[PDB]
Design a protein around this ligand. Structure first.
Ligand SMILES: O=C(O)C1=C[C@H](O)[C@@H](O)[C@@H](O[C@@H]2[C@H](O)[C@@H](O)[C@@H](O)O[C@@H]2C(=O)O)O1
Length: 404
């Protein structure tokens, strides 16, 4: 009798396939029981942080790439997956993808898929507005006015949650200035005071120009998860800047015959870098002090490499990085070139994208700092310049506490 716990986050679609997959794993292993612990994205890091701090975390965990500096600054925060290469077939995963999940020579997670945020639009609402998807940043910004005038105050080209908006304006600044957002050497942000004014100026331009809801309007709806909101479902918020690895958590909730559809990626003329946030979409990791490292490794192998786990898990986490698994899905017809999830990624890789994102750009204190920031602008409390100075200063402080 081996009892394991496994945690993950996701939409219900992803819960349903994972639960299906675990039922098979247990069928194939009468002696290995897994308790499942699963939520949506919200509060999930927060809960696992409490567990890790009291040493009660699961044997198997779905982890995020930006959590490596949080839990595993020295690579010892999770079990070294090189120690279970007997159970877990490592050679299926690219050596260069494995390097992103390796810290101090210790393999901390198996990246499941890679992802970048890209534009996805409600094709139904865009057809009503009689617009083509923006091919440029100017078109992005000019599209809100058309939405509001052709369809009404209630229609937006996109909805952006603050984290979405952070990634977007950084993409714009990267395209423009071709520098990293974080100076990792000096433990701080790389942008000048001016560049930060320009960053929050752009937010406010987009908000003024009716591109997406302001934070104030977004909060007149209730708290709900974005994909469960009426204006998302009703097709009133007509798009998202979103990971291809979890796009169906969004599209599953549109009203037929509306589809979320790949849009073009805006690029400034002369840009030497598309400014993607491209990374492991997520990982499977083993608890540092698991009493069952081998059975855990068997479970991770099953879900990522076995015929039956691969078939069960389908594309709820994106296009598998496992050679065997992505080949299976292609052969079964599950990966198709025209799938917006698949096409999202392919279009993205062809974008020039040499700039890597620092895991610190996605520090949860920095992300919350950013939502706070644009809330001050939207609720009249801080001007654009004050907000830019406030972000620069307080975010630098977090980066020193984060980069410790
Ligand atoms: O596929 C996912 O569930 C996923 C891929 C991203 O790499 C992760 O950072 C994580 O993103 C979460 C959330 O699930 C997603 O809906 C979006 O809101 O952004 C979140 C984020 O932290 O970026 O999940």
């Amino acid at each position: 009798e081996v009892n394991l716990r496994m945690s993950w986050w996701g939409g219900n679609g992803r819960h349903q396939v994972t639960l299906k997959a675990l039922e098979e794993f247990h069928k194939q292993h009468p002696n290995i029981n897994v308790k499942a612990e699963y939520t949506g994205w919200d509060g999930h890091l927060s809960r696992l942080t409490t567990q890790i701090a009291g040493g009660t975390e699961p044997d198997v965990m779905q982890t995020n790439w930006n959590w490596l500096p949080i839990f595993s600054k020295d690579g010892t925060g999770f079990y070294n997956l090189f120690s279970v290469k007997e159970q877990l077939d490592l050679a299926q995963f690219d050596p260069k993808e494995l390097q992103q999940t390796t810290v101090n020579g210790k393999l901390n997670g198996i990246p499941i898929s890679v992802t970048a945020r890209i534009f996805y639009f409600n094709d139904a609402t865009w057809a009503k507005a009689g617009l083509e998807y923006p091919k440029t940043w100017d078109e992005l910004l000019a599209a809100g006015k058309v939405f509001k005038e052709k369809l009404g105050d209630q229609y937006y080209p996109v909805v952006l949650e603050h984290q979405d908006t952070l990634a977007l304006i950084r993409s714009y600044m990267t395209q423009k200035y071709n520098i990293p957002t974080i100076d990792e050497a000096n433990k701080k942000f790389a942008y000048s005071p001016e560049q930060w004014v320009e960053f929050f100026t752009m937010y406010k331009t987009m908000v003024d120009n009716h591109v997406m809801p302001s934070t104030k309007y977004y909060a007149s709806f209730g708290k709900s998860n974005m994909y469960e909101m009426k204006p998302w479902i009703n097709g009133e918020w007509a798009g998202t800047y979103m990971w291809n690895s979890t796009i169906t958590k969004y599209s599953d909730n549109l009203t037929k015959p509306a589809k979320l559809v790949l849009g073009p990626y805006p690029m400034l003329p002369g840009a030497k870098d598309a400014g993607l946030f491209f990374k492991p979409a997520q990982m499977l990791s083993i608890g540092k002090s698991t009493k069952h490292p081998q059975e855990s490794a068997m479970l991770i192998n099953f879900l990522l490499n076995s015929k039956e786990g691969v078939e069960a898990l389908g594309l709820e986490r994106g296009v598998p990085l496992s050679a065997t698994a992505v080949t299976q899905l292609r052969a079964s017809g599950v990966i198709k070139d025209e799938d917006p999830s698949v096409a999202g990624l392919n279009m993205a890789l062809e974008l020039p994208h040499k700039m890597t994102t620092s895991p610190y750009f996605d520090d949860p204190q920095i992300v919350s700092l950013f939502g706070d920031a644009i809330q001050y602008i939207d609720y009249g409390q801080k001007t654009v310049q004050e907000t830019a100075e406030y972000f620069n200063k307080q975010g630098d402080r977090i980066l020193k506490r984060a980069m410790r």
